[PDB]
Amino acid sequence: KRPMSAYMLWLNASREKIKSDHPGISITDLSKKAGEIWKGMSKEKKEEWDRKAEDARRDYEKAMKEYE
């Protein structure tokens, strides 16, 4: 669904910098840290990640039409 895909695009793009700023962070604490950063981001920035994910979903669906 759209919230999950928007979050996944953002976190994959941001994971390296978040981890670099938190040396030694555990798997579990990184999951929690990322959740807090997302909640702190502005509504507009999160809508921007949703727009990027919707673009990628549309591209995938188009390419899958070509495949099938």
Question: Looking at beta carbons, which pairs linking 25-30 to residues 24 or more positions away fall under 8 Å?
Answer: none
6, with CB counted inside 10 A (0-12, 13-18, 19+), is buried
Structure tokens at 47: 């809508």
Burial zone of 16 (CB within 10 Å; 0-12 exposed, 13-18 middle, 19+ buried): exposed
Technique used:
X-ray
Report chain breaks in the chain, C–N > 2.5 Å, as residues after which they occur. none
Identify which of 46, 38, 43, 35 has the alpha carbon closest to the alpha carbon of residue 2: 46
